[PDB]
Amino acid sequence: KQVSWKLVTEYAMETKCDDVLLLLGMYLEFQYSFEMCLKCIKKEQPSHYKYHEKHYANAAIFADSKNQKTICQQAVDTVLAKKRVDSLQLTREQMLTNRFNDLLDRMDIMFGSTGSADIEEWMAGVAWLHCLLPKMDSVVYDFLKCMVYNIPKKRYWLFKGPIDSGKTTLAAALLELCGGKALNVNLPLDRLNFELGVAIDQFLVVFEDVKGTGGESRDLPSGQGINNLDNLRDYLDGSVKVNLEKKHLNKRTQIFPPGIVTMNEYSVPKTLQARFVKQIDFRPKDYLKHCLERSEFLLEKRIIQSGIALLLMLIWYRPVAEFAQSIQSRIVEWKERLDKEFSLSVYQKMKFNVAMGIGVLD
Amino acid sequence: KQVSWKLVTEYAMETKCDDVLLLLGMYLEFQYSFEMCLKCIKKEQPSHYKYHEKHYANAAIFADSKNQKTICQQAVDTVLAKKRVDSLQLTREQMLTNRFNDLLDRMDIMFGSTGSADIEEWMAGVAWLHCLLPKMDSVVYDFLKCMVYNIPKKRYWLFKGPIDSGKTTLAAALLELCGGKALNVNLPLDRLNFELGVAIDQFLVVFEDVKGTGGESRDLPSGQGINNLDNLRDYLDGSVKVNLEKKHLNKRTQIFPPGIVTMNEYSVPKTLQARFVKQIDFRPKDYLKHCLERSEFLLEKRIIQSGIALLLMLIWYRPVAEFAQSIQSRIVEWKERLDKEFSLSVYQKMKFNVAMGIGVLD
Amino acid sequence: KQVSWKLVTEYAMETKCDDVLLLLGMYLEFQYSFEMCLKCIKKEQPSHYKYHEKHYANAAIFADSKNQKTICQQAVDTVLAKKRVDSLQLTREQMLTNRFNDLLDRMDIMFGSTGSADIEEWMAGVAWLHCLLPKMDSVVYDFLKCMVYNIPKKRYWLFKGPIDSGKTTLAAALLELCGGKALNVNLPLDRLNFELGVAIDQFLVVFEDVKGTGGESRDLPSGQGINNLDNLRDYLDGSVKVNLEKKHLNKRTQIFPPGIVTMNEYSVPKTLQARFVKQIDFRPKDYLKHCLERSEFLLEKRIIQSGIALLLMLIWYRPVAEFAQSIQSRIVEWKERLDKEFSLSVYQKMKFNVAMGIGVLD
Amino acid sequence: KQVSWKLVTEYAMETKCDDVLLLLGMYLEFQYSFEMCLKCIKKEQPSHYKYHEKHYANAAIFADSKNQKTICQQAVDTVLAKKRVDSLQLTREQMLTNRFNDLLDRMDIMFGSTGSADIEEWMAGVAWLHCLLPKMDSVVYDFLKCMVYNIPKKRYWLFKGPIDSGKTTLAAALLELCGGKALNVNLPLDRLNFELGVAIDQFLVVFEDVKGTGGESRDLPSGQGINNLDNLRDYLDGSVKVNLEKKHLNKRTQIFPPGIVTMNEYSVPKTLQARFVKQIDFRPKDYLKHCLERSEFLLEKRIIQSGIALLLMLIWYRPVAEFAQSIQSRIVEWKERLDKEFSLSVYQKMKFNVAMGIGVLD
Amino acid sequence: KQVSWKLVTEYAMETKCDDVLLLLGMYLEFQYSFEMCLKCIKKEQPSHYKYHEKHYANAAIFADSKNQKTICQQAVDTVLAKKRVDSLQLTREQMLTNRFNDLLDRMDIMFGSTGSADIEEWMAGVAWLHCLLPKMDSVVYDFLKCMVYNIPKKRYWLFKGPIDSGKTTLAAALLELCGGKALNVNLPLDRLNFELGVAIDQFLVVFEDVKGTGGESRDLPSGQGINNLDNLRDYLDGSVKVNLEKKHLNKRTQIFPPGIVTMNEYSVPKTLQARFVKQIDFRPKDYLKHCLERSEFLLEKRIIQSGIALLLMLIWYRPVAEFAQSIQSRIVEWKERLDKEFSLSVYQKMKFNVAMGIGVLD
DNA sequence: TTTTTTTT
Numbered sequence A, B, C, D, E: 001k002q003v004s005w006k007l008v009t010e011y012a013m014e015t016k017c018d019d020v021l022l023l024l025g026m027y028l029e030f031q032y033s034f035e036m037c038l039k040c041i042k043k044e045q046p047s048h049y050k051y052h053e054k055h056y057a058n059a060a061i062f063a064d065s066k067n068q069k070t071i072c073q074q075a076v077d078t079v080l081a082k083k084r085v086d087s088l089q090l091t092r093e094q095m096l097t098n099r100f101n102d103l104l105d106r107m108d109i110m111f112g113s114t115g116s117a118d119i120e121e122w123m124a125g126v127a128w129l130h131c132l133l134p135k136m137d138s139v140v141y142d143f144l145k146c147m148v149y150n151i152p153k154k155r156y157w158l159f160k161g162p163i164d165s166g167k168t169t170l171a172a173a174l175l176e177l178c179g180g181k182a183l184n185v186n187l188p189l190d191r192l193n194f195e196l197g198v199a200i201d202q203f204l205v206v207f208e209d210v211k212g213t214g215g216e217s218r219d220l221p222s223g224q225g226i227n228n229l230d231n232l233r234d235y236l237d238g239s240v241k242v243n244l245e246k247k248h249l250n251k252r253t254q255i256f257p258p259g260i261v262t263m264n265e266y267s268v269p270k271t272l273q274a275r276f277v278k279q280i281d282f283r284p285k286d287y288l289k290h291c292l293e294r295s296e297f298l299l300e301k302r303i304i305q306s307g308i309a310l311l312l313m314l315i316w317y318r319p320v321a322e323f324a325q326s327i328q329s330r331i332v333e334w335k336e337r338l339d340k341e342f343s344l345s346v347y348q349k350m351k352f353n354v355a356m357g358i359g360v361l362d
Numbered sequence F: 001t002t003t004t005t006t007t008t
Ligand SMILES: Nc1ncnc2c1ncn2[C@@H]1O[C@H](COP(=O)(O)OP(=O)(O)OP(=O)(O)O)[C@@H](O)[C@H]1O
Pocket: A162, A163, A164, A165, A166, A167, A168, A169, A170, A264, A282, A283, A284, A285, A286, A288, A289, A292, C239
């Protein structure tokens, strides 16, 4: 009596499993009677307890199979195929819509019955970020627009200033909010090439700490990143398809994603300055350090650097119409939950404390 | 019963699907009821809704097979094999009739019953393009007819210029018309020594931001590309078929295609100048800016860099003589529409709006 | 009759074996008569003598199989798939309890009656360690927390002190305790690429004896590791994911582990100094050397380097509540076993002997 | 009722096809009815229409095969094995026989129906070259059979005479006639080894101007290269095998190819001239360059540079009995196919004009 | 009937044949009748003639098989599998005990009836080596024990002396006796990575002729090696695990083997001298030289190079009780053989002859 | 067979 490969593939679709080993490992767990399944009884992993009962019968047969890896290979290929179909057909708006659904699914789990996330801690993060710069949530919408529109030769925002001024914290939150990857340009010119190959089929990329020259003027270590980025003008323009690469692999050719670049305050040629649509300078604020010192759950749980903290900020501050028709359904049930559990007085007390440099919770 | 690999390959042929994962995914969609199919109901994707009903039955049999990737591989290979036999045996003129049939089949969709964009906008593009430089449209025909009739030096162009001067947009439009690839050769000798190999069965090639070591009198970003391209004489000359590099796949030796160099305003040795049909020496013009600033619909839709933007100009300016007889059936019939949809006052008014720096539309 | 692949997969899981040849070679041993198996009779290897009697029947048929390596490969994949599942789903604290349970299992054999250690010698090692620094056991707890919490920019401790002052000894013990890798960054920048690849999915890392520059007056040889560390800030900070690499294998994206830097008495740029959480100064002290030269079994058995000794220190010193919940049952039993076998007076006698520089035992 | 693997191999042998995708692509076309096959109707391509009618029956069965690429791989293997077996046996005349045919095949297209080569201006170059130096058809015939005989010590030619005396041009033209490559010597000795490796299995090789010391006062670039050359007594005299080397690969040994050294009016130690069959001195003579200045089409169409111009000279001067014994038939076809076009008188007309310095044609 | 894969695997185990091709070739020789087989008849190779008659029947079927290399692969895998088990499980004493059995098996053949060696001449080897240093036999026993215990710090021995003073001769015999590798550390610092890579999994290592600074003060050449050893302290002390690399392979980690260092009499940095357990001085001695002139058979048969000679010395000189217990039975038989073959009278005259510098034998 | 090594 044979294995249903169809049931296996369906699990890999429903749980969007990218890895043969991950798929293999988790399907094996279903061989034990879900009846007795300690993990299900303790509700610890949705990708398991949502499925164990349905897949149990098939898993017992799969446990005996001699073909196992081949069964998994066909499954993962199907998920990969689905991604390429999507990537070659979705609008960037629809792509962003899908990412928001993924994050909302995580939020529903985080604050769910399992409930491990304290939404009080998470909302403190929103206050801190809204405090960091003026008009914060409006600036986020402007970033989201230009990432969606992907307007050629107006594609990159420059984050600049002194150290410990939060630029990477915001960048990491933005990069979790979208999809994307960090990349490092501060490399010898031969090394860059498999490296920039990583950007294949990503939605954002972030370049870090790109080293200027003559920086000792500023007590900055001079280095390559800026002079390398000069040679990348074609990629930054996004004005025509570039070629990308991997080991043992042929190239793929595509427009290069949009993104963000971070800078200690080196000088830059204006020939390059022309190629950024916008620039933001970050500057230190004594009271924020005090606040974090009092409130280290903000750091220890990484809340301030999470895309989930940005998403909550947007849900709080933006109109419902700023979200696509499909997700407005879920935006509705989230806006109410925040309000139902943070009266404006609560958030005011928080945002007050942040500005005061007081420990946020009291 | 059992999968018809024949029907698979017929889909792959008729959709020209070169990609095994793309093909795998696309064909798997057909497993569901076409009579239900929401994509067919939307008429969302041509390469779906044309075919779903026909392949539905075969896809259900495919949906349970265990050979799935192997089935796709054979089918895809006939696509490549056809493409390569065709590449070898067809005249470059016949190739253009093929390429032009392709673009017409897209235009057939773009202004199909969906009216998915308004042709007024694309024609505002034609005005914004043709107005750029003397006799603009004619240059397209001259360039194209060089790309068929290959001759030494009479194979390559310099698009020299300053910042913000259209050369890239021109080039991008030309490539999206013709089919081909772009390249960077500011990148070093070894990278160049592989990347020259991109030319397999391509009709045309273009080069990007190519910087020469001089030009600090114009403070240019400066580099090796001048020396490299100068040194890349066989590829330039095309006087014999040359090796084209590949990784883990069959390399080949072919006539190196014709193409264009874009470069900034470097100093150039007169011998290095003595290599072309012609230089085109790009310059800025003021009205363009103000037009676009109003006409911002152009760029989210990427009209002015599209290939089909050119073809509308070409249709606009050229006599019916300027086309092959097989396409003349389509071309003439299609050329009718422009009068139905534009009195010439429209085009006049648009180009005047362009000239006056207004939003092109009124 | 036929081979049970399932029993092989069980054995691989039960022994947690990863190497296909180790698994193969092991399984083959069961083919001989269990009732005459000299290894079983001699009770030498538990991974043999627990299992031969059970597996014997299937091992005879395996010994005849024409397919032996494919059977083993599927079994190894099952074990590796478990590691993958764990790496994604477990918390850092859970990983640490798994490691502790494995070490506790290793301890239970060594100090079993069928074991081979002397618990008095292994306890003697603890006395030497608790003299090596002030409040040694508290420092271990504070370090363990630091690695479990993994707080960005607060992730690395610096060990410095003259040569022959125990820093490498202590790192090797913590490294065995947690699992991890040592790394050497006194390299040219190219090879350093693959060297940092070794960190992949490790819990800790230890950078070994990085070399500063200048200080021939310090009488330290100069090198370049510290200039390299100053580049690698991003890897220390753990703020954002980064891409690791292996020979002939694709780039792997993860956040980089927390860890330790060890260093002789070089000067350190304030930048790197600001980037370490804590600095521990080791010093050479005579009575340790004199005691150690009288207590050489401490060296001979590697007692002083080995993580088992640190775990024993925590069991002795720390409250039971400081251990994760489920292991408290086992930890309580070990505390009782230690108390059964050592008075406080024995431990006090040992520490006083160490202070006197006499041999620890008396 | 089954695919004959045999017939597929035959077609691969007759096409001498070395590519599995091409062979796949080609053979699939035979599946349609040969009876109406429009390529068979149009008769554009004999490599199709010769075969379709025979293969059609088998091609239908092939088009239904699920194994197609495997059939085709075996077919290409056969042709590669065939070429390898043959390649191990060649006389140098069989080499020259094979390498001749390429030019004829190309001419059969260049001046064929595609006809993009003007045979007149091509023959104008042939006439032009005739007066560069004495009796050049015999000079080349004497040179060339020496390259077949390859008799030790009797294998190398030296060009002398001042800048702009034509030696670079004629050398490169002969290199085109022959294949092979040229090499430098003007390097510190270690560099030479991999460059010498280029000679591996070349039919012929060349050496560029030797930067001869004993050129200083002559104001020629001057230094080691002549003394470097003097150290390679062995290779040139070509009695015995020698080692050769390449980047990233192990050594090989061969009898080094025969060849040419090309030089200006330097010094020469007798030690080196002792190694030569023939000195030739080159004179700049004004009617040559001034005719070219009056005939510069030769430069653009690369005519005099071309190896086909050299073979054309031989074809038109030399007696049929001198060419490769069987191919003489084909040579007579080409002679006839040219004789009808050009008399001695028109060729002599050209010769008069060049000798007078007048532009070649009238 | 069919190939028994088991009988092949049994041959591979008993010949300990590690290489698939060697296993393949060996087994095919059994095709022919052992009854006539000249290799059997002449007793040329025990790995043949001990086995031909048993394996003959299976070899006949093997020679018709179509799977031949597959059978060899699984057979060889069994051999490798046995090593991997043994490497991780055995004690250093058992490893040496196994190594002794192998050498004794050779001696059983070598001094057998077919045995081509003279036990008399090989006993001259023992006489010469027992002359080379005071208490030679005791030195060997202490060295071996030191390797077996592998006590950290106390791991390494230093040989010093003039050229042609014997240090390499003794290193070579020790290295054969134990198994191990010779390494060169006079390299530049970069290449050292792969050189140390050779130490992977060895039992001993020998470092060859490490050159010091400034030994030109007594005509010695000079180089890096001593400075490099002043780097690698932990490799010598052997307290801590270290990473090791091979070309194209990911690093592995282990304790670095114990071993020997050899040098001419440079000065030694006392940092390095503190590493070594013991220094042995080699000094040239005329009577050894003069005796060696008249005992050429020692050199010509490489007697004094070989581990076999040392094992004979240990058998003669050490008590039976002094070996690991499983070997002691064989020792008694070899003791009995040797005491029959020589009176103390004869042996002591030979030592006297070496002191005479006369030929050993009379 | 590339990529790693080797080349540099
Ligand atoms: N505006 C600010 N004023 C004061 N402290 C700040 C500010 N922004 C961030 N911080 C502190 O700086 C720490 C580091 O933040 P972050 O990494 O985002 O800074 P950065 O300037 O982007 O640094 P880098 O260039 O090193 O990546 C934060 O954890 C926070 O404690």
